[PDB]
Design a protein around this nucleic acid. Structure first.
Ligand SMILES: [Mg+2]
Ligand SMILES: [Mg+2]
Ligand SMILES: [Mg+2]
Ligand SMILES: [Mg+2]
Ligand SMILES: [Mg+2]
Ligand SMILES: [Mg+2]
Ligand SMILES: [Mg+2]
Ligand SMILES: [Mg+2]
Ligand SMILES: [Mg+2]
Ligand SMILES: [Mg+2]
Ligand SMILES: [Mg+2]
Ligand SMILES: [Mg+2]
Ligand SMILES: [Mg+2]
Ligand SMILES: [Mg+2]
Ligand SMILES: [Mg+2]
Ligand SMILES: [Mg+2]
Ligand SMILES: [Mg+2]
Ligand SMILES: [Mg+2]
Ligand SMILES: [Mg+2]
Ligand SMILES: [Mg+2]
Ligand SMILES: [Mg+2]
Ligand SMILES: [Mg+2]
Ligand SMILES: [Mg+2]
Ligand SMILES: [Mg+2]
Ligand SMILES: [Mg+2]
Ligand SMILES: [Mg+2]
Ligand SMILES: [Mg+2]
Ligand SMILES: [Mg+2]
Ligand SMILES: [Mg+2]
Ligand SMILES: [Mg+2]
Ligand SMILES: [Mg+2]
Ligand SMILES: [Mg+2]
Ligand SMILES: [Mg+2]
Ligand SMILES: [Mg+2]
Ligand SMILES: [Mg+2]
Ligand SMILES: [Mg+2]
Ligand SMILES: [Mg+2]
Ligand SMILES: [Mg+2]
Ligand SMILES: [Mg+2]
Ligand SMILES: [Mg+2]
Ligand SMILES: [Mg+2]
Ligand SMILES: [Mg+2]
Ligand SMILES: [Mg+2]
Lengths: 151, 262, 205, 64
RNA sequence: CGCUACUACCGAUUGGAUGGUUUAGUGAGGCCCUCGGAUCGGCCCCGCCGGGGUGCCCUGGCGGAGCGCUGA
RNA sequence: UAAAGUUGCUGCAGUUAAAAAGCUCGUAGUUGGAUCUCUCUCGGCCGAAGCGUUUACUUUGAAAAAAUUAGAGUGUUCAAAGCAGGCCGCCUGGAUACCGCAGCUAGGAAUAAUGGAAUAGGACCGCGGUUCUAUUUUGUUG
RNA sequence: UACCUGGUUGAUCCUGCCAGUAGCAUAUGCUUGUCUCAAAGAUUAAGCCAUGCAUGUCUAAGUACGCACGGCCGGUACAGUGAAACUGCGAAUGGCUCAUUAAAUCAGUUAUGGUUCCUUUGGUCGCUCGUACUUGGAUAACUGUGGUAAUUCUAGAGCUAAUACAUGCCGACGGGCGCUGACCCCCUUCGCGGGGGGGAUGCGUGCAUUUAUCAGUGGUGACUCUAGAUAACCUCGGGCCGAUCGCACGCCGGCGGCGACGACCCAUUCGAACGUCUGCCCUAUCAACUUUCGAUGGUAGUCGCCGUGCCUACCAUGGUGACCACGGGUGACGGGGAAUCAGGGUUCGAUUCCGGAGAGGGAGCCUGAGAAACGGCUACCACAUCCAAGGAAGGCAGCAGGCGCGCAAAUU
């Protein structure tokens, strides 16, 4: 998978990839070291992020983002943007005059890392709050759980 | 509102000052200082409302401008100086020393201390950071930074500071079984032994504390102040020994005192 | 004047937002510092909090780092050859962050010839005028010559950098923000980044 | 802003039916027997008793 | 159908009056950039030079001129 | 505003008083039949760790401006108020409750949703393999 | 106090409204002896304003050659009181009002591991190897010549200060540490050669700034955090590394105690500014909206105190909606709260506390830590003042007060 598709050169800023190498240690390529971080709160780092090659500065595991504040869950409704998806959060709002609830929802645009592959319309995503990534995106997908009847 | 605010409405002042409603529109508005505005006792309130040494604000100013009041061993001529928890107020002309200790009902009590005990104080540690060629630094709840602290001293611990020099003399580690006072919230002013601390990563930690009478109560970690090692406090406690009476037993005690009076 | 507020923008649903206050001073913006190549001209800006931003209008000198050799030197900025954002920036020779620039290679060649005692970027005429013959061959004690011979075993430069040294100009990336700090610093391109930008530059023309 | 207090109460309430024989007679009996100035004094005492009864009724429904 | 009054509608009139949005053009004023250079200096040069060493220069204090060199 | 159960959640009406679509299908919405009685590792028997599918619900705990409201004390001469005051320098207050919803917290598991094996794309025991990899080796070096 | 009563009929029982009943707020009428609290130009006109006042400020400790007083002694540079003026600070708080504003404001809850912060408080301030027993030029006050019808308008001339403007050392200072490596020594090896030392001469050096690289003191749930090492950089529109004042006076020929100002940086306090989650009235005779001039997302940058379509270039075609989007209306600033109320509810909240907005309407700025400030400035629009007709000066939704509007509201 070629990772150079923009006008600029895509690269993890922390990793230095031009270290001098003698010809005796030139067994193909050096297998460019991968930068990854362990986000806390008991979330495992996907093996894809560790062993991947994608460049994503908004990735919670390989990019420059900090998970802080609220951790929420939603259902994936649309995946038509690049590296970001639209999830749906449903809830019941109480009305005190009638002592009864009404069904409400709100969509949320959340950044989805390339480390989560095979995400389908319908699965559950645990997202975590971060700094503003775009005009409307303030959350990053931290965990993906499949639907109840997946193959 | 452009720029900082300089006034404080009397009804908007913190309730533990015990300010009335009809004396004026405004309140003393504590100056910026080592203690937060909501958690301090301005010098004027203590010197006029509490001790009744002065009748008006001008008399408080006249008292302070003769350099009679010392807060933690230093002369303070600012009448709105924020004096807060564990501060030592010394008046040598009349020869008394007070320590600002929360009462059981969450108010700064007039607590007189001996001059031997007025030479030190206890400070909670807020953070530890290394700077400037690998020199460690401690920051206390009193906004004083101390370089070269003991490597064992960690956050949420308590250090005994010699007021004359400003150096650490000993410390208490934050651990279960150590005596503590609650410095904020519903249980403010209560004294008890730490029983258990539950950690919630990314959120606030809750500390459970058991009184000397067997009562238990929870607080947030930021509301806990280690007072003594084990059951013995390192300072003198106010007349109420940190235990909270319910309104029923308070009424019974008041009635017994009334009956025994005369 | 120039504003950076979020309330003049439409809502995520596409509806218009009616402003509830007029433009505030803390939302201001300022005209761009289209830094050019030329004799140094830098203006200072008094910014929020009373601090200072340095607004570089003209620059001709930068501090660039050869990462593989860890050799940082102050060199002369020559030309702008690539810009990933706009082509008019290359056309007008504007120094911004991440712009590809040609920097003079003389200090790096001097450091290489003084540290490895091996020629770099030299033609085959072999002039080697004095004080360069000395810096390249010299006479040294057995220990010093042994140390230099030990160095020579791991002194091999990539062919692309060797070609650039022959030309006298290296490709570098600007990692600083000239319009904010008044400085055009960066690093000498090498490795796969150098190949990528060489291919991009060739395809651009 | 001023340094004044505005807490105040009405010490009485007025009856909903203005003219009824039994209430008027009972109030007049109380006025004559206790030398009261008007019916507002009767209604004031009635209001204090009503507040006391309301507090007691609130307390009764609570657990012993 | 006839008598009196009121309300409302359609309104021919191509209604006006007020306000609010915009197309196109013009565009005060500030701010930024590129210039500009009225003036005011300093160094230098001399007539002028206080004295040190000794006529002898290392510094005062003037006048004259240099699109001299620079700064504002 | 109450009276108005004449806006009806509590709690109204629709044969004849005003009122059920001409009839059927049908997306969203609303509602939906029985059934199922915590441990393996770490540190000093406990403290720790998960995770039991997730909750809703219920109870508790924390955090939650003052004023206002409720309310404790207190003879403003009484009262509306106030936060004062009492004793022959002392003594004593300036309480307490309440604060939807959402968000934290820890118990309960009835009720109500939700899942767990039916191309075995099953659980547990041992096996064997395949690959990569962190350190044991080891006064030391090596 | 969980309440009803009159009215359709010749009479009856219903449905059903009209009317009665009580409270609460505004106005108004008649009446009014005492006393304690106490609202008060919100509604209509965020309409218009005469006049006066509403923000100024000095200690022992920045600058005193005003005899303006007063010396004590009279050459004791400067006694003291001290107007003025320069310097510094404040004027961004407070007060007023409710026009705008409909997920906006605001409320509760969280975040800044994404920023700024005068001041107070504590730390740091010989850590840097490079005339000082004190540097330079002005300017005000003051003294004198003035101009204009007119302003808190100012010009020319003559002096003179600094904690205003600038400039600029000594010292600690001996070195240490990186690099360099003329040379010298020891060792082994016949020897070569290898190994180990000492070293002259050169470049650099501290904390802040910018970039790159290396290793992994303390910390976090999580840093690309903190600290460390290396190569450099370090803006003429410059970063810190004291040319400052007062009071006591001393000791051993030099050292010094209290303070006050100032200062880069860190922390602290007071904040502020963006965000997270949930919550708002009526309306479908508003059903599709946004996207060609950013709408939604990606990459690189610009600008900004910072995170961000905030803006630009190039890409992708997205983003919201019957769970009511978008549009319209509101006699809509939002809350804490208020009236009424058996229980449930309905209505009110311009109004003294908190938050927001505005200063006739828009817009743009200076200074400052902090305004897009209006009892600051610059324009245009609408009003409007003085004028000698050339020009000058405006902003009561501050306190009083006037006009106007009105059913509707107080003392220059
Ligand atoms: Mg204000
Ligand atoms: Mg946190
Ligand atoms: Mg600053
Ligand atoms: Mg135009
Ligand atoms: Mg212009
Ligand atoms: Mg009603
Ligand atoms: Mg009823
Ligand atoms: Mg009915
Ligand atoms: Mg019918
Ligand atoms: Mg039918
Ligand atoms: Mg259906
Ligand atoms: Mg069922
Ligand atoms: Mg409250
Ligand atoms: Mg009360
Ligand atoms: Mg709750
Ligand atoms: Mg009939
Ligand atoms: Mg009849
Ligand atoms: Mg009626
Ligand atoms: Mg009546
Ligand atoms: Mg009288
Ligand atoms: Mg008013
Ligand atoms: Mg008005
Ligand atoms: Mg002044
Ligand atoms: Mg100040
Ligand atoms: Mg100021
Ligand atoms: Mg300080
Ligand atoms: Mg002059
Ligand atoms: Mg960016
Ligand atoms: Mg983007
Ligand atoms: Mg564009
Ligand atoms: Mg309005
Ligand atoms: Mg409202
Ligand atoms: Mg209001
Ligand atoms: Mg109004
Ligand atoms: Mg207000
Ligand atoms: Mg404003
Ligand atoms: Mg007006
Ligand atoms: Mg303005
Ligand atoms: Mg005004
Ligand atoms: Mg103002
Ligand atoms: Mg007025
Ligand atoms: Mg009238
Ligand atoms: Mg009136």
């Amino acid at each position: 998978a070629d990772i150079q598709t923009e006008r600029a050169y895509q690269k993890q800023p922390t990793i230095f990839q031009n270290k001098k190498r003698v010809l005796l240690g030139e067994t193909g390529k050096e297998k460019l070291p991968r930068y990854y971080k362990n986000i806390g709160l008991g979330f495992k780092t996907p093996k894809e992020a560790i062993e991947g090659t994608y460049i994503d500065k908004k990735c919670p595991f390989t990019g420059n983002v900090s998970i802080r504040g609220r951790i929420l869950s939603g259902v994936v409704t649309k995946m038509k943007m690049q590296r970001t998806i639209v999830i749906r959060r449903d809830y019941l709002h109480y009305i005190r005059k009638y002592n009864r609830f009404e069904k409400r929802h709100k969509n949320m645009s959340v950044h989805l890392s390339p480390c989560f592959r095979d995400v389908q319309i319908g699965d559950i995503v645990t997202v975590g709050e971060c700094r503003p990534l775009s005009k409307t995106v303030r959350f990053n997908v931290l965990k993906v759980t499949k639907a109840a009847g997946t193959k | 509102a452009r720029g900082p605010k300089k006034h404080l409405k009397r009804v908007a002042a913190p309730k533990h000052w015990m300010l009335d409603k009809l004396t004026g529109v405004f309140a003393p508005r504590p100056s910026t200082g080592p203690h937060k505005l909501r958690e301090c006792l301005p010098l004027i309130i203590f010197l006029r409302n509490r001790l009744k040494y002065a009748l008006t604000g001008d008399e408080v100013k006249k008292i302070c401008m003769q350099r009679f009041i010392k807060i933690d061993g230093k002369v303070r001529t600012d009448i709105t100086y924020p004096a807060g928890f564990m501060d030592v107020i010394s008046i040598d002309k009349t020869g008394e020393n007070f320590r600002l200790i929360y009462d059981t009902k969450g108010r700064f009590a007039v607590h007189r201390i001996t001059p031997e005990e007025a030479k030190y104080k206890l400070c909670k540690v807020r953070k530890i950071f290394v700077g400037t060629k690998g020199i460690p630094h401690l920051v206390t709840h009193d906004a004083r930074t101390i370089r070269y602290p003991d490597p064992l001293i960690k956050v949420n611990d308590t250090i005994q500071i010699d007021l004359e020099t400003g150096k650490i003399t000993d410390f208490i580690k934050f651990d279960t079984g150590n005596l503590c006072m609650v410095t904020g919230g519903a249980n403010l002013g209560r004294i008890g032994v730490i029983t258990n601390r539950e950690r919630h990563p990314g959120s606030f930690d809750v500390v459970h504390v058991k009184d000397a009478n067997g009562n238990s109560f929870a607080t947030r970690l930021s509301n806990i102040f280690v007072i003594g090692k084990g059951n013995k406090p390192w300072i003198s406690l106010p007349r109420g020994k940190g235990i909270r009476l319910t309104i029923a037993e308070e009424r019974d005690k008041r009635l017994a005192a009334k009956q025994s009076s005369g | 004047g120039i504003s950076r507020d979020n309330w003049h923008k439409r809502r995520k649903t596409g509806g218009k937002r009616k402003p509830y206050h007029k433009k505030r001073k803390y939302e201001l913006g300022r005209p761009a510092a289209n830094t050019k190549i030329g004799p140094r001209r830098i203006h200072t800006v008094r910014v929020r909090g009373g601090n200072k931003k340095y607004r570089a209008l003209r620059l001709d000198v930068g501090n660039f780092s050869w990462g593989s050799e860890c050799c940082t030197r102050k060199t002369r900025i020559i030309d702008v050859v690539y810009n990933a954002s706009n082509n008019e920036l290359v056309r007008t020779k504007t120094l911004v962050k991440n712009c590809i620039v040609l920097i003079d290679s003389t200090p790096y060649r001097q450091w290489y010839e003084s540290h490895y005692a091996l020629p770099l970027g030299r033609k085959k005429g072999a002039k080697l005028t004095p004080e360069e013959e000395e810096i390249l061959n010299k006479k040294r004690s057995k220990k010093i010559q042994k140390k230099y011979d030990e160095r020579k075993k791991n002194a091999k430069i990539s062919s692309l950098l060797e070609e650039q040294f022959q030309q006298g100009k290296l490709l570098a990336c600007i990692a600083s923000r000239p319009g904010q700090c008044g400085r055009a610093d960066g690093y000498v391109l090498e490795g796969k980044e150098l190949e990528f930008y060489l291919r991009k530059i060739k395809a651009r023309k | 802003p001023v340094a004044r207090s505005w807490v105040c109460r009405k010490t009485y309430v007025t009856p909903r039916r203005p003219f009824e024989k039994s209430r008027l007679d009972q109030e007049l009996k109380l006025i004559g027997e206790y030398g009261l100035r008007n019916k507002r004094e009767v209604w004031r005492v009635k209001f204090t008793l009503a507040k006391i009864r309301k507090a007691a009724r609130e307390l009764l429904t609570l657990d012993e």
